[PDB]
Each structure stands twice: as C-alpha cells, then as structure tokens.
Design a protein around this nucleic acid. Structure first.
Lengths: 164, 258, 182
RNA sequence: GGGCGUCCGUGUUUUACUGUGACUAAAGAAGCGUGACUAAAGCAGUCAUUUGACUUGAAUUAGAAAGC
RNA sequence: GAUCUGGUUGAUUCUGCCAGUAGUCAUAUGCUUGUUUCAAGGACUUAGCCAUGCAUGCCUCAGAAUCACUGCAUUUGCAGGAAUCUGCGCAUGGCUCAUUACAUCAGACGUAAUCUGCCGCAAAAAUCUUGCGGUUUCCGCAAAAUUGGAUAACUUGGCGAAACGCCAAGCUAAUACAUGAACCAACCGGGUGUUCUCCAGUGAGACGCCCAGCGAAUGAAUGACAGUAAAACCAAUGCCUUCACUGGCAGUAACACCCAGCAGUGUUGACUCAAUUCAUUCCGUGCGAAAGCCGGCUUGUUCCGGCGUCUUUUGACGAACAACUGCCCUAUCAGCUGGUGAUGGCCGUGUAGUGGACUGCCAUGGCGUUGACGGGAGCGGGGGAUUAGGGUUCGAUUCCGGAGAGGGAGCCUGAGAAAUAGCUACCACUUCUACGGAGGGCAGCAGGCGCGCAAAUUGCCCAAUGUCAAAACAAAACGAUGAGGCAGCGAAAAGAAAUAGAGCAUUUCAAUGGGGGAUAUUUAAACCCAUCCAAUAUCGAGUAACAAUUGGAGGACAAGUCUGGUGCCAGCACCCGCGGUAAUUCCAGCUCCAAAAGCGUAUAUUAA
RNA sequence: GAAGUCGGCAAAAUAGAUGCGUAAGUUCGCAAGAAGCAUUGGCUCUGAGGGCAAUUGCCAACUCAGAACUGCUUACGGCGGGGAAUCCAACUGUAUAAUUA
C-alpha cells in the first residue's frame, strides 16, 4: 500500500489467434529481424497503433488548432529522430502510414547487423547481450534499444570489450 | 483537529515527489493559509538546498538562524506565503516569496534596502475598543491607525524594520496588479475595469503588458504600483507575461542545442 | 442524553430516517433549569468552548429598567403575575424570559422625585424646572407607583444568564396585559 | 456654462442553445521536455570547468450535471 | 484493428438462439520455471473469536533536586541526574466497510446562526498591598513589595492470595494552588453639596462627595444626509459697534479658559452588527507585573537580551449546522405523515448557535404516478476494465469525505470525545483466585484457531517521510514512534530478456552470465542492482548434463487420409460430433502446430 | 393445578368505564367485547363547552379535558373467562303441563 509507482502494458495479443495469413507474416518478420518471440512483434504493433491513433485525432482536427501545432509537431519531430520517417516527409499524414518494419529497422539489433558489425541478426543479438556493442561510449545490452538517427554514427564496440 | 498532511494531498507547488515519502510537513496556523503557503522547512530543505534532510531542518531552524519578517523563526511548520521576506543573515541572502508566472512560488532576490519593504493587502477594516481603527492584512497583521484613506482592496506598504506603514496604494482603473490565486497566478496587469455584482464575486478584468485580456475574481487581485511601468516590488524575471505554449516549446529546442 | 438532532423525526414525506450514526456531544439539551422566586441559587454549567453559563434555580431581586426614562434599578421581584405559555408557570412562579412580573417600584419613586422633584438647592430646583418641560408621565404608571408595585416584563433569559432583568411595562402593552390579566 | 466618476430619491424581462471567460485537490488518463543502457518508470538533470553555470527545469489539455 | 466463424435442411434463403475468441491491477486452481527491475497481498465467507510480544509520550541555557544516587570538589558548592509534581499531547495516525437513498458523498453556495487550544499580528494605566513605630484590630512616617499552608517523591508502620489493587502518620518544593500590589500614572465623563466666590435668573468658578478599566447582562441614545431660495416677529445667545443691551447682521465649524480642530464621518450587498456615551448591575461562574525562569554583563535601586503565563481581541488550522443540482433494482410495494410532532404560527425552553430540537396554546396542513411509503443490493467519490462512436460494467482497497471499535446505551476530562490500547452499566463470550475477590475487548503490526475456492514474518530500524513534545546538534548526555521505512514470504498484475554465436557428416576459433568471489560498492546494518576477473598479483560452460514447458493435430482453428492398442468398451468432445474390428477425434509412439518463462482449466465481467 | 372423573360435574375464574389495539374465515352484513395492552382514588387548581339585557353588565345548570400535591391493606353492590377445530340444524321461533328442549 501507499506505494505509487505507475506501471502499464506495452503489448497486446491479437484477436483471431491463428490466421495463416498473419502467422505467415509473423514468421517472415521473426526470421528476418532475428526476433525471440511474437511478443516483440505485438509490441511494435501497439507503439505504432498509439502513435498512429493520435495522428488521426490531431488530423481530424482543424489546421492551426493549438493542439495540432504543438502536439502535432512533437509526434512529427520524434519520428524524424529515431528515423521512423525521412526528414523529407513532413505532412503529419505520413505518420498515419507507417509499418511494423519501419520501427524494426530502427532496432539496435538490425542496425548492428546493417552497420556491418555482424553476420546477420543472430550474431548481432547475441553480440549485444555479450556486452560488446556500445552506442556512444555507453554499453547497451538491450537488443530492442531504438537507435536515434543522430546516434547511428557512434556505435562501434565497447572499450571494456575484447575489441578495445 | 488534524495534524498530519499527506504528500498526495499536499499542494502541488511545494513540489515534492510522490515517491520518497508518505507525508509532507503540515504547516501550523500562522499568517498565511494552509493551501497557499510554503513552510519554512520546504524552503530550506527543498528550495534553497541548505539542508539535505529534515534533521538538518531543526539543526538550522531551532538555532533561529533563518529570519522571516525580521523575526527569527524556530518552526519548520511555519507558513510563509506571499510578499513575505525571508532573510538568512549568516549566508547573506534575501528573498521575497512572490509568485512566478506559471503559478508557482519563486524566490526573488533583493537588495538590503528593499527587504525593509513589505506591502500587504487590506482584507478587512474594523473598529477596535476605544475607536481605534484596524486593518487586517492578507498577511494577517492587524495594523492600527492606518491611513484614513485605506479601504478593503488596497495595499499598505509596511516597513518591517522600523515597524510602521509608509505610503499606501488604492485600486482604481489602471494600477499594476499581480494575480494571486486561480489559474492566472503571477500574471501581472492593469485593472481595465471591475464588475460590480453585489452579493457575489466581483469579476475583474485585467490587461497584461503588450496587450491581452483576462479576468479573475477581484479577491485574487493584489495592487502594486500606479502604472504597469512603476511597481513598488521586484517581480520575477519573467514579469507578468505568459508566452504562447508553442513559443515556450520552440525556445526550449533552440536553447537545447546549447 | 437529550439530543437536538433531527435524526429522530419523520421526513416531510413521512418515512423514518434510518440512523447509521451514534449520538454526538455536539448535540445537547441541558435539562431546563426552572427558575423561581426565592433566595438566589445558581448552578454553573461549563458548555461548548469552556465557557460557563449560569443556571438560575430560584432567583429573586433582579435588575429592572424604566424605558422612556433611560434608567434601571435593582428591585425585588414581588410576584409572577402572567405568562403566555402555560398557566401553570404562574402558579408555580417559574421565571422565564417575557414572563410578567410585579416589581417593588419603590426606588423608582425615589428616582423620579430625586430627578424631577415631583413627589408622587436653588441651583437644582431650576434644573427640575427644565426637566419638567418637554416631559410627561402616563397615569397608568404613576398610578401603579402609588401602590408601590409596577408590572414589569423580564427581559434577560434567566436559565442561560442566571439573572432576571426586565422593563417596566408601558401603555401600548401595559393596557394589553392589564386587561388580559384581569 | 457644459461633462464623466460616487451615493441616494423619484419615474418592465427571463430561460434552453450557443461563443468566450471565470471558478475548481493530488494520484489516475491525454500530453511537452529528458538516452534512468532500453523499457514499465521518474521529475529530473545537463554542462563547463571546478572552488558554479543554466536565472536551470518540473510546460499544457480534457475532467457529466449544477452553479458564475 | 467500426471484422466475425461452426450447429436446424436432401439442398436453399431466413429468423434465431447455443458454441467458438479477445481482453480483465479478476479471483481461484493445475502443470511448469534460469536471471533481473516494480508490485498486490485475511476485502468478498464472520464487523467471527483471539494465547503472547510490541503498538506514543515528550525536558531544554531557560517549571519544581538534600535520592540516606553516581562523578569531580579549597568553591559554597558545579556538573550528570531515578523517580515525582507541573505544562502539552494521547480527539491525530493505523485499520476496517457493519450500518446508510432528500442519509452519506461530489461540484457549488452559506453561517449576518455559532464554538475555535496550539500558531501569526496585536491590545493592556479596574485594584489602599507591604514594612516600622505606635495605636481604637487606627491614624501617622516609610517604598525595589522580602506573601501564605499543603501535597507528591521520600521515611515509618503497613493491608492483601492477587490485582495498570489500596490505608494511616511524618517531611518538603512550584510556572501546582491560594492571596495580592497604594505613588509612580494621564486624558474623558455622569450625578450632586442648604459648600463660598463673584454678576445680573437656561447664571460661571472653585472645592467637596458618590460613581467613571477590558469582558458579560438588561435598558436608552448614536450607528448619517438627498424633493427649494427669501424675511421678521418674539426670548435667549453669539458676534460687530458704542458709553451703556447702544444700535445692528458685517464675520462664521464647534466649544464658557487651562486642548483657540485630540474624531461633526466604523463596516458591509445589507445588520438589532463594530464602536462610543448614559442608567442599574457582575459576589464566582472572568481578568497578576506567573509576587515565574536563565542568559548577558562594560554595569546597579529605570542596564540589556529570550523565554513563560493571565484577561481582551482578529486572522489562521479547524469544528458543527444548513442544504442549489445529481446518484442502483423493484407496483406481485399506492397511498404516506398527524395518541405521544405530522407541515406552519405565537411566547418560551434547550443549544456553541439556527430550528418542532423541545414544553404549552392555535391552525390543518405537508409528501405522492415527474414513483411518495415499503422492500432488496449497497459506504460516497477521485477513479479502474472494456470500448470506432454511443455505451456496459467495477470501485471493501493507497487520496479526500463519512462511520465503527464484540453488542447496545451513559458520561467524565478537555479548545475539541458521546473517545473505547478512557471511565460506568447491562447482554453474549471469556481469564486468573488461597472461594473473599480481581480482570478482558487485535476492524493497530506480527502471529494463533475458525471459516472458506481464497491471501506473507510472533523479522530489523527509526537511516528517510511525518507527527506529538518541556525538544537542534554535539559535548559524560544519540526522546517515543509495528505511523513509516527495510528485508523475508510472494508466477495477482506490469517492464526488460538468457537457454547459443562464427567459418548432415564433422572439426575447432572465439564470446558470454547462470554460478563462485572481491580492495570493495550498497545500506542505519544486512540485502538486491550496478562495477569487477588484474592494477604488481585472483574463478570458470560443450552431449551448452548449465538438458523449456503447457495445451493441441476431423471442423470452427495453425498443425498427420503415419504406426501400434481398443472394439458404442474405456474414454474424448465448450458446440458439431468421434469409438459397435482397417478410429484423420479415445489410449500410446513418432511427427508437426500455437504460445513461450510462461501455459491450460473454473466462475465472474467487457467486446463479440 | 384436572393427576379427579363417563365427562372440568361443582367451585374458582373473567368483569364497570375510558384510550390504543384486534386474526383466520365471510353471504361484505359481520367475525368482535375476538385476542391483547394501559388508565382509574383523594385533594387543591386550570381550560373548554352558554343564556339574557342595554363592546359592556348581570346570571343559571351541568359535563369533559389538563396540571400540582398526596394516598392504596388493590378493599361494598352489580357485572363477559378466552382461543384452535370436527358433527348437526341455515337463522329468530315452536315444542313432549309432571323424566326427553
């Protein structure tokens, strides 16, 4: 009692447990991004849904409405950071079209593999827990670390690792 | 007759984490009301940081090192609300407790000479035994033989050093006013006009600098100076002004670059 | 004990209030103190902030005011003549506010002579001459003063204050009670 | 000589609805900022370069009905 | 993601329900578990019953020290101080949801209808005391007011089985209690002398006398004004003019000196209020400069400083009342209320105060199909689940508000109680006893029984957050605090993420933390996390035996026309339907499927 | 305290008046005085209830309610015990003068 510490859900299980169309789409992502579980998919479905949904609400709204400017620019900024979107795209309509890969491409696991420090994505996911990759001078052990686009220059390897 | 006051039920302005305690220090009756006041303990401990604990609260206070209103105060539960003057002679810092814009307590620093000055709103005016008139200030002072002109709603500029009332300030038409209470706190402006409403609140229209309009109940108005260009107290660094919420944000990004 | 709350009453609509609360000390009735003529008695009660209110069991002298003359005098209560609530309170003589009383009347005579010189120092004779003018006294009073008993109406609330104080009745109401009395 | 301010004396319109505005506890919900390694959180912290700096931050919104 | 699918027919198209699946800080239960971070946890059934332990007390430079107490001791004693009186608090916090539908609660108003300790700002000239001498127990001289008797601890005797059970007698303190202070010391008034000082009777002046303080009582006055501009006659009175009350309206706040302006004007929307004046009161049921304390001192017959307290007053923290709008289901509850208050009136009484709250009299009202009355389930809300939207549902539970301490009732003390770790009684239970008696109240925290589908340690600590308090800390000398915090137990929920990576035979190049451990870090202490395998110098994984499970494989619904066994048997199956000798469904083996340190099942609920 | 006895036969019991209250059944009329509870004296007062004559004056005859004080040895006569059911006749009435109502 009397302990106020807020906790929350990050993910949701889909209705219709097994559809061979979805399950197919699931596995095709699990093997491609080297994912441990479906759980890590359903997560970027909800962070994408929440994000998407406030894009609708603000979008249904009249232009120059004070929420649409302030609260609208902030969703439209944070997607330029993290590089969910390209800095060429600012309509706020673009937020309303995003896909599960966009947020998975940005996950430190794929990027360490894309940056080329690893064989595919399984080396990359182990090589993160093995504590060797550091983002900028900061060792980061979480595969799901979402890599801010300003930070994609700095990864390299740890200085406590074998590699430094 | 309650004694304890819980964090979640403490006023938000004391600005005390929900975690890290069940309770907040409950202020005793005093000059200023419970819901609007900042205890001394929250001043030294949380605001000024001179004390990392409540244990260091009594270390510093019970020694009477920390003055408000020229008088040394021993009590961490003492309410010090607004217009108050909190001096520490040891370090040599001097604070007026005035509201910040954004509706928060800000501690203005002030010169040696201006801590003498304290100016207090006239909450009531009555006759004491033997025809003595008295004025009961927002602060809680009972001030005998005020100016024959003073009336409810006027400020009494009060010298806290030598104890006496220097010049007063009426309230009519344009006179600079700091809003105290009710969502416009700290926001300054002239009175543009006052609505009458006998038997109920008088709603009181104001105009900040650079033009803008807002209302309050006239019991949230505290007079200061004849014009908005002349004020008899030192207001916080953002004077009375509210920035647009979209200008506040994009100036925290530009400065964020360092 | 005795209680002043409403929790025992039929609602406007006639139903019972169901009491979920116990009695409070902020609801109290202190049995009546039924005052009477007699040698002074008092039982002090301490009430609701530490304040005492003086119950007067059995008080007699009492302090009576003669309005239109702006005076008062300390005068025995002779009798309880009339009461508007119960007729028993007269037989029993309980003194309660706005009872009617017969009062000794004698120091009023001495005052009215000492003041206007009229019996019902040449510097002070002419003052009498000056006080006469503009001034007149209703027969109905002065006719009562001859007897040495004046109908009064006791103004203090004798259970709370512990004293019986009143006014001498006047013609507008003095004629109402005299008739209503006999 | 005319004109505002104040007070008093003598000789007719509301309400729903709508716009704006006051007035309203925190936690909770929505939300800004912020690499607590990420996240659920939190309201913190960040920076020089030391013997402090940022006038350091802790924005803002909704919250039936009724009442103004 | 504003989504639907299997079952009625030989087929068809419908209605239409059952079944399916997705949540739930929704609880239970089953099998299963390596690591971490933050969490609920005797509410649901009994507001059942409780063994034992703890759960509030507090003293500074500053209220009372011969402990026949401990230290030091060439000073009359100073340094601690055990108990004990005194002052404050125990009315808060904690727990719990039995009661409860114009009650409680929410938002919004009100107290001008009131009580208010502590806390802030302020107020303060009521008072014939004391000593010496005398003496009529009364004058007269004098002025730093040098007041009183009693109680506890304690000693002596002790009673009693015992007991938060008691009795005598003897000592002694106060900021306990009781008394009490004149001149210093002002201004302002009312009433009046068979008072004398004057000048002509609305005369003035002195002096004498009784009374003139805050607060309370009754009475009287004040608590403004506003709808008109000249004149003159009389008495007084002012002022001018004369010489004379002589002639006469120029002048202009008031007022018969000692004060030539020391109030001609309190506050509200509004008051019988604030305050002022006059008349009688106040007998304890109000009023000290605590006749109080320790510090300075450059110094003591007005040096100075900070505390303590009385009475008055008004802000503040509160208390208690009232109630504008709104709150579930029921008519197989339609009339409800007035004997003995029901709705209103009058004079009271009682209250802190308003009031049918209550006594006496008077009237006949008040409420109801826009659901009264009755009954059923319920603490109210902030809020939670789920929702495209609209909604449906939950809210015992952290914050606010209400109520209770086994059941009922009564009350003392106090500023505040109808208080229960306070008293008194009865009821139901129960614990000691030497038989005479004396006790108890866990819906405080641990824990026990019981009950039940259902819920942890008789653990450490005040380090933090608050509270009370005579209180800073330290210095011989660290207040209590089961409030609160910390850990134990803890797959209720929630976040992160291991169980291999690299170039089917193999083979070998690294890497890692589970775990071990640490100069340590952490913490009140210990934990956990983080940091670490040399920094001169310290561990380690290959069948990774350091080995992932729980439910399924006819359909809905993703995944076998495998192989055994059984023969309408045993069993599966939410629904449809399988099994009666080649079973896609049971029991098994292999194989694949979904989810995965998590996964089935039951009931409740939301979407469907 | 019905054990008596064929059987509560006989006796006891109930009891006036006023207020509150009153079940099943029913032909709605009753049942009903159902059942049951409570009050009662004496004394000293108070209120209400009218007539007549010209607001005022004078007068008769009683009843009811309320209060204070005080008392009970429960104390003339007179005056219902009540409730749950079965059988029969609907009811009031008549009827074996002198064994049957």
């Amino acid at each position: 009692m009397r302990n106020y510490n807020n906790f929350n859900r990050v993910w949701k299980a889909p209705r219709r447990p097994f559809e061979k169309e979805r399950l197919d789409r699931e596995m095709k992502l699990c093997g491609q991004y080297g994912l441990r579980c479906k759980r890590e998919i359903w997560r970027v479905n909800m962070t994408l849904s929440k994000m998407r949904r406030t894009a609708r609400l603000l979008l249904t709204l009249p232009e120059n409405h004070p929420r649409r400017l302030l609260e609208g620019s902030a969703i439209m900024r944070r997607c330029h950071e993290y590089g969910f979107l390209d800095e060429e795209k600012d309509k706020l309509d673009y937020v309303l079209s995003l896909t599960v890969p966009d947020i998975l491409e940005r996950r430190l696991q794929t990027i360490v593999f894309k940056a080329g420090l690893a064989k595919s994505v399984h080396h990359a996911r182990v090589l993160i827990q093995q504590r060797h990759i550091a983002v900028a001078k900061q060792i980061v052990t979480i595969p799901s670390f979402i890599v801010r686009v300003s930070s994609e220059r700095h990864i390299a390897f740890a200085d406590a690792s074998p590699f430094g | 007759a309650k004694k304890h006051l819980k964090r979640l039920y403490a006023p938000k302005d004391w600005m005390l984490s929900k975690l890290t305690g069940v309770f907040a220090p409950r202020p005793r009756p005093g000059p200023h009301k419970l819901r609007e006041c900042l205890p001394l303990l929250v001043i030294i401990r949380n605001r000024l940081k001179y004390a990392l604990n409540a244990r260091e609260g009594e270390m510093i206070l019970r020694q009477g090192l920390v003055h408000v209103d020229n008088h040394p105060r021993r009590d961490g539960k003492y309410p010090a609300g607004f217009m108050d003057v909190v001096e520490i002679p040891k370090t040599g810092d001097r604070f007026r407790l005035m509201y910040d814009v954004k509706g928060r307590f800000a501690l203005v620093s002030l010169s040696e000479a201006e801590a003498q000055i304290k100016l207090m709103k006239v909450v009531n005016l009555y006759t004491a035994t033997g025809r003595v008139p008295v004025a009961v200030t927002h602060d809680g002072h009972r001030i005998r033989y005020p100016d024959p002109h003073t009336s409810i709603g006027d400020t009494i500029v009060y010298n806290v050093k030598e104890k006496k009332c220097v010049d007063l300030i009426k309230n009519r038409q344009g006179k600079a006013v700091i809003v105290t209470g009710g969502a416009n706190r700290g926001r300054i402006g002239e009175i543009v006009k006052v609505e009458c409403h006998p038997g109920a609140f008088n709603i009181a229209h104001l105009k900040d600098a650079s033009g803008a309009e807002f209302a309050t109940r006239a019991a949230n108005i505290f007079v200061i100076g004849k014009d908005l260009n002349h004020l008899q107290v030192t207001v916080p660094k953002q004077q009375g002004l509210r920035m647009n919420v979209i200008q506040e944000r994009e100036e925290r990004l530009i400065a964020a670059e360092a | 004990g005795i209680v002043r709350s409403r929790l025992h009453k039929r609602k406007i609509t006639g139903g019972k209030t169901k009491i979920h609360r116990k009695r409070m000390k902020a609801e109290l009735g202190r049995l009546p103190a039924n005052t009477r003529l007699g040698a002074r008695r008092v039982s002090p009660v301490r009430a609701r902030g530490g304040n005492f209110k003086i119950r007067a069991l059995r008080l007699d002298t009492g302090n009576f005011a003669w309005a239109s003359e702006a005076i008062a005098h300390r005068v025995r209560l002779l009798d309880v003549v009339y009461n508007a609530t119960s007729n028993e309170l007269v037989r029993t003589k309980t003194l309660v506010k706005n009872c009617i009383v017969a009062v000794d009347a004698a120091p009023f005579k001495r005052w009215y002579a000492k003041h206007y010189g009229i019996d019902l120092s040449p510097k002070l004779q002419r003052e009498w001459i000056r006080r006469r003018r503009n001034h007149r006294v209703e027969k109905a009073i002065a006719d009562q003063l001859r007897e040495g008993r004046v109908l009064a109406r006791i103004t203090s609330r004798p259970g709370q204050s512990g004293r019986a104080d009143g006014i001498l009745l006047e013609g507008a109401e003095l004629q109402f009670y005299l008739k209503r009395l006999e």
